[PDB]
Amino acid sequence: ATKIDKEACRAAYNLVRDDGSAVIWVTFKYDGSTIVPGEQGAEYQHFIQQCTDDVRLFAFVRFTTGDAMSKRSKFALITWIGENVSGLQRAKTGTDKTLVKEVVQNFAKEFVISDRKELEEDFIKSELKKA
């Protein structure tokens, strides 16, 4: 029965899509059976800190990539599912990212991550470049 607060989540998505907003990441979390916005940040290290081994969340992140001609923003969807989350809830989260993408429609790449090392900016950015 997962639901999403589309108006509230859209505002968070739109915030990161605004190149001028100074907000480079937003999270979405479960409030019971509804996915709602969580946190916002300007500093990527503060995103990593939200991703504990005990929680599941979705994140939409603006990365600045390239240089000169190749400079551009690339957006990522990250579904973080900490290693202590049960298999049943891990599967439900990965099903539910389809619903999240009714709001988070446009992205360069999406990720499903349970190893904290893969949240590092340098990793995500190397995956975006390969990609």
UniProtKB/Swiss-Prot annotation:
Keywords: Acetylation, Actin-binding, Chaperone, Cytoplasm, Cytoskeleton, Nucleus. It comes from the Eukaryota. The keyword Protein transport does not apply. Residues 65-74 are annotated as: Flexible and important for F-actin binding. Residues 1-129 form the ADF-H domain. Pfam families: Cofilin_ADF. One of its GO terms (biological process) is defense response to fungus. Changing residue 129 to A: No effect on 5LO-binding activity. InterPro entries: ADF-H (IPR002108), ADF-H/Gelsolin-like_dom_sf (IPR029006). It is found in: Cytoplasm; Cytoplasm, Cytoskeleton; Nucleus. GO terms for cellular component: cortical actin cytoskeleton; cytosol; extracellular exosome; extracellular region; ficolin-1-rich granule lumen; nucleus; secretory granule lumen; site of polarized growth. The modification N6-acetyllysine is found at residues 101, 125. One of its GO terms (molecular function) is actin binding. Transmembrane segments: none annotated. Widely expressed with highest levels in placenta, lung, kidney and peripheral blood leukocytes and lower levels in brain, liver and pancreas. The modification N-acetylalanine is found at residue 1. Belongs to the actin-binding proteins ADF family. Coactosin subfamily. Binds to F-actin in a calcium-independent manner. Has no direct effect on actin depolymerization. Acts as a chaperone for ALOX5 (5LO), influencing both its stability and activity in leukotrienes synthesis. Interacts with 5-lipoxygenase (ALOX5/5LO) in a calcium-independent manner. Binds to F-actin with a stoichiometry of 1:2. This is Coactosin-like protein.
